[PDB]
Amino acid sequence: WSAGDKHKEGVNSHLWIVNRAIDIMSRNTTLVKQDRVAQLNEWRTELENGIYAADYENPYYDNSTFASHFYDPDNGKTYIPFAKQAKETGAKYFKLAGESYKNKDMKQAFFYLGLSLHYLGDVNQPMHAANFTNLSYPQGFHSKYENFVDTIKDNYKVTDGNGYWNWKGTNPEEWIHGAAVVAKQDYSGIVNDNTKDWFVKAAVSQEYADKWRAEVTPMTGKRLMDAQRVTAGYIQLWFDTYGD
Ligand SMILES: [Zn+2]
Ligand SMILES: [Zn+2]
Ligand SMILES: [Zn+2]
Known about the structure:
Number of domains: 1
Protein name: Phospholipase C
Cofactor: Zn(2+)
Shape: globular
Radius of gyration: 17 Å
CATH superfamily: P1 Nuclease
Structural class: mainly alpha
Strand content: under 5%
InterPro entries: PLipase_C/P1_nuclease_dom_sf, PLPC/GPLD1, Zn_PLipaseC
Order of helices and strands: HHHHHHHHHH
Number of strands: 0
Bound molecules: zinc ion
CATH class: Mainly Alpha
Helix content: 55-70%
EC number: 3.1.4.3
GO molecular function: phosphatidylcholine phospholipase C activity; zinc ion binding
């Protein structure tokens, strides 16, 4: 997903996803200790810096190839042979964040948490869970799709307190893998012969530009909502694990 501005949701789908996940935690009055949301807000600048940094600098964006931002659950690889993927990378920052949290280094802790949340968010994007890049056929579709998402994302907010609490085990890799599995199952709802043909025709036809956008909207909504619920459960796991 996009992460265009450090502290604005406008063209930053990643931040939007995290903010909506936090809202789910706030809405829950049965099992969530609200002081956890207070801490995320206290160190929000750092959390957002981490969410943004993943797509802007090394080592996070791998020399502008973004290889660590992809993860196919069926073969466990990213799109570049031998490169690090999103599962191991997301888990890495989940643990670094937690160790810093226990050591009372809050800025370090929430910066790393933000990075981890970014990688978890990415595997929820079907293209990232299936190694479909902006160079994949049809080339240019990946970037156009993620920019389009920003124009409609705010219409798919989860409005209840039902995050996926204890969705997977205590291992963050299990959560990232699990999210990638669902995202890949949903891949054909975004990338198929129809959306491919229409995207290409959109080059010279406004009608087809609107056609592929409409076609991918329902599944986009599903992916954004699942992303919110999974992220909420993931944050809860982090505090349950490292929260004193
Ligand atoms: Zn992304
Ligand atoms: Zn992308
Ligand atoms: Zn990314």
